[PDB]
Amino acid sequence: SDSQPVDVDNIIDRLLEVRGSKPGQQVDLEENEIRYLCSKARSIFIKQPILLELEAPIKICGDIHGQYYDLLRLFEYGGFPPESNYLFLGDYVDRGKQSLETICLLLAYKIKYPENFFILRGNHECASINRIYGFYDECKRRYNIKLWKTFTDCFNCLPIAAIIDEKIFCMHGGLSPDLNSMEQIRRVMRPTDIPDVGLLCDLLWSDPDKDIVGWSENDRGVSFTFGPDVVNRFLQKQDMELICRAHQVVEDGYEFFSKRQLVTLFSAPNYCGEFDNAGAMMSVDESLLCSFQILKPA
Numbered sequence: 632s633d634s635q636p637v638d639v640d641n642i643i644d645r646l647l648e649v650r651g652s653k654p655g656q657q658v659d660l661e662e663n664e665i666r667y668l669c670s671k672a673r674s675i676f677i678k679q680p681i682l683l684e685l686e687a688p689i690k691i692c693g694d695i696h697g698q699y700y701d702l703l704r705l706f707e708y709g710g711f712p713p714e715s716n717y718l719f720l721g722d723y724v725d726r727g728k729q730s731l732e733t734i735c736l737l738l739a740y741k742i743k744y745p746e747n748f749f750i751l752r753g754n755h756e757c758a759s760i761n762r763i764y765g766f767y768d769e770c771k772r773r774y775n776i777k778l779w780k781t782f783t784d785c786f787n788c789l790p791i792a793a794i795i796d797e798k799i800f801c802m803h804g805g806l807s808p809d810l811n812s813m814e815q816i817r818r819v820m821r822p823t824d825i826p827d828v829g830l831l832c833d834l835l836w837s838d839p840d841k842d843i844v845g846w847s848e849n850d851r852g853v854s855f856t857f858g859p860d861v862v863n864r865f866l867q868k869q870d871m872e873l874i875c876r877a878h879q880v881v882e883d884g885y886e887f888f889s890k891r892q893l894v895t896l897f898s899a900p901n902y903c904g905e906f907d908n909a910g911a912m913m914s915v916d917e918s919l920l921c922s923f924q925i926l927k928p929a
């Protein structure tokens with residue numbers, strides 16, 4: 632009577648209520664509502680495979696980094712669920728100052744539309760990184776450290792890659808020298824933190840590099856860079872048409888690599904208030920043709 636079961640439809644309403652407002656306006660979610668979001672989505676993440684098999688049509692977004700009103704802006708261009716299906720590619724928290732609203736809306740939509748809304752792990756969906764780039768501060772300030780740990784236990788169960796109609800391979804970062812076969816991705820055990828070495832690390836951290844042949848060291852201090860030859864060989868070996876990744880700011884919101892064999896998507900316009908970039912959202916139709924909706928910075 633005083634207690635109630637958490638209602639996901641009700642939480643989505645309060646999250647979308649600030650649509651007509653200024654960036655900065657928060658959303659009071661109750662601490663048990665957020666634990667419900669984390670625990671219910673965690674259960675869905677664990678049931679669903681760690682390598683998602685998805686079907687077009689689908690809209691795809693890159694990094695968000697707590698720019699919550701840009702998340703709302705993306706849904707205004709793409710169609711609020713369930714009007715469009717979605718795949719997000721990671722990096723939901725840190726750097727911006729409304730990571731809480733950002734991840735909460737995504738978890739809510741994962742729970743409400745579990746067969747039509749999908750989110751992948753990025754390298755900022757790890758307790759170690761997000762305790763230096765902002766999400767830890769934000770949870771502590773607005774709630775408490777124990778809630779932040781509820782998020783990271785959930786983050787540790789996030790799927791790590793996706794395949795769209797056997798032809799588009801999707802991940803936050805890039806390829807790995809240890810990616811022997813897709814089965815190796817399916818066997819990655821959850822929950823786990825992101826290691827400093829190995830297949831899972833590279834999937835969430837590696838970068839393409841136009842000026843390299845093969846694999847070289849990554850200036851991020853972790854994982855590697857790969858050249859156009861690496862993408863070419865992987866698509867031949869795996870019989871696929873496109874790698875769709877995020878993880879890097881790109882001026883026009885999207886940017887191809889190795890003769891359009893790989894695309895980088897970035898969905899946070901005017902990233903950090905510094906970069907003057909657009910955001911892009913990639914639309915994949917049943918013919919597996921890709922088009923881009925562009926969100927220029929306000």
Ligand SMILES: [Mn+2]
Binds near residue numbers: 694696878879
């Ligand atoms: Mn990022």
Ligand SMILES: [Mn+2]
Binds near residue numbers: 754879
């Ligand atoms: Mn990243």
